[PDB]
Design a protein around this nucleic acid. Structure first.
Length: 73
RNA sequence: GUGAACGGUGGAGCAACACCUGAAGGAAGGCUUGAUGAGCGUGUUCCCCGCAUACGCGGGG
């Protein structure tokens, strides 16, 4: 990976570096994420709200958007 | 398939016009380039100082 974010053709968001480290099971919430509407209520927090959003793959593909429980950036 | 992928902040524009740094102000008042140094006396063994180490050398009044 060289760049992150959008508009990478104009040189934006060039990644200086990254580190990948293990963390405890209860310490990391991976659920801050576009989740389906029938998701587990343990996984759903107060930040997650219903929207027309992709939960997978090409997140820009409006034909693949579903009724999702997603948080807000 | 990083809600991505695609996308020029561009084109034009006088800092410039006018405007006297200088009007006035004493380098003055005293002062031998001539002085100084360049010529006129003593008539024979006697005190001190060093090198030596006394055989004598050097100096000194």
């Amino acid at each position: 990976c060289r760049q992150i974010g959008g508009k990478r053709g104009v040189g934006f968001g060039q990644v200086a570096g990254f580190k990948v480290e293990p963390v405890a099971e209860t310490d990391c919430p991976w659920s801050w994420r576009a989740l389906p509407a029938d998701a587990d209520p343990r996984l759903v927090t107060s930040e997650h709200a219903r929207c027309i959003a992709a939960i997978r793959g090409p997140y820009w593909d409006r034909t693949l958007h579903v009724e999702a429980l997603a948080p807000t950036p």
